[PDB]
């Protein structure tokens with residue numbers, strides 16, 4: 001009988017972490033036009049346009065993310081919709097860390113926020129919050145490997161209060177990626193140092209919930225008063241926020257914590 | 260030829276957790292005499308006598324603890340000497356939890372401390388500290404299985420600053436028992452709840468270091484002034500403290516933390 005299991009294939013397939021590196025989206029440009037006054041209406045509209053372009057790349061990434069296709073299609077869609085802000089804000093801190101040593105907020109190569117832009121955007125306190133996350137990346141010396149696994153965990157960090165179509169399939173993928181992170185933090189065996197770091201990384205993931213809650217509060221507010229505020233949103237964000245706003249505001253979004 | 264492998268033996272061998280249950284020491288009596296006044300000198304001397312009897316059982320337990328025999332003998336002796344206070348204080352909170360719902364400190368069947376004895380012992384604050392751990396066992400609904408594994412982790416929680424004869428053998432055993440706790444807190448699937456409990460238990464373990472440091476400070480103090488204070492110590496404790504006092508006080512005891 002022909003062996004159905006292929007030792008060669010299992011040994012040859014890239015590790016999950018290696019696949020994450022391979023499928024990570026290339027950098028996206030904001031299309032920022034410096035001729036426009038740096039007022040909140042203009043800066044915020046630009047950030048919304050950038051967000052739409054980033055999400056187009058996020059969905060392509062999710063399509064080839066190992067294990068994600070094992071979840072019901074409706075759950076894949078649900079998870080992207082509930083995690084979008086966490087994913088984009090986390091990636092913003094990563095780009096800021098890698099490209100500016102966490103000195104500025106690197107939204108895109110053509111849109112880098114310094115203190116002035118943060119004030120002008122009318123969301124200064126929120127910019128400071130994401131900047132703080134960037135500063136923690138330097139203190140922790142976060143690695144790309146760690147970052148990629150953590151971004152998947154954020155995709156799996158908020159679920160509908162009633163649950164997904166397949167909680168078991170979700171739980172399997174989540175436990176698998178948590179395992180990857182645990183192995184990632186372990187040569188020189190030192191359980192103590194390994195657990196201390198694992199703890200630092202899960203505390204940071206947990207801290208994303210409060211930050212994301214505040215970012216969404218601002219997002220939903222500007223969306224609701226888009227006309228009065230003159231803040232424009234691209235189709236992709238109208239699609240996402242139109243779905244998310246009522247679900248989050250009615251208390252249906254359940255955060256998953258490590259601590 | 261005669262098969263050297265025994266399928267039967269493999270199948271019948273109990274799990275490590277079952278072995279921990281099987282080797283748990285039987286309860287020890289203090290030999291408390293209520294006819295004598297409850298002065299600090301009498302109460303502390305009785306607790307020291309109890310401690311000696313308890314350590315005799317701890318050494319018998321360590322001899323049959325799975326994996327411990329794999330470490331160099333020098334390291335087995337060292338770990339027992341560095342962890343004695345953590346093991347005895349943790350076991351005290353366990354008995355208090357199981358026998359009095361954490362209302363009192365159950366040192367032994369014949370010596371249960373209520374607030375009055377805590378004051379009379381002249382170590383009131385320290386008693387409150389161990390009492391708080393007892394109270395945490397109720398809040399967390401600690402199980403006997405969780406307790407036996409955590410007790411082994413405490414045995415492996417303090418090492419010489421220099422280092423053990425075999426850090427690799429030590430690390431292997433510590434990792435194996437951490438793995439046991441990890442699997443023990445798994446539910447039937449819910450990583451969120453499973454990690455939250457693992458976090459609660461490791462934070463509890465970490466909290467034992469500060470409590471133990473304070474208990475040891477009091478112990479070393481009473482030990483060096485035993486004559487003036489009229490506090491007696493049995494041979495077993497004179498042996499343990501004579502070894503530990505200078506090592507701990509010179510900064511050679513390195514606590515291992517999860518957080």
Ligand SMILES: CC(=O)S[C@@H]1CC2=CC(=O)CC[C@]2(C)[C@H]2CC[C@@]3(C)[C@@H](CC[C@@]34CCC(=O)O4)[C@H]12
Nearest residue numbers: 044047048050051088089092107215218219222
């Ligand atoms: C300073 C920021 O842009 S923070 C945050 C994360 C982020 C990082 C990127 O790299 C890409 C762009 C995004 C997704 C922002 C898009 C604009 C968001 C949704 C903002 C939080 C609140 C705001 C302001 C306008 C509005 O209506 O809602 C998003």
Ligand SMILES: CC(=O)S[C@@H]1CC2=CC(=O)CC[C@]2(C)[C@H]2CC[C@@]3(C)[C@@H](CC[C@@]34CCC(=O)O4)[C@H]12
Nearest residue numbers: 303306307309310347348351366474477478481
């Ligand atoms: C209230 C306590 O006894 S707390 C602590 C843990 C403990 C729990 C037991 O179940 C058995 C007995 C032990 C090991 C105590 C023995 C007495 C100790 C070492 C005390 C902390 C300080 C003191 C007072 C006298 C002295 O010289 O040092 C030990």
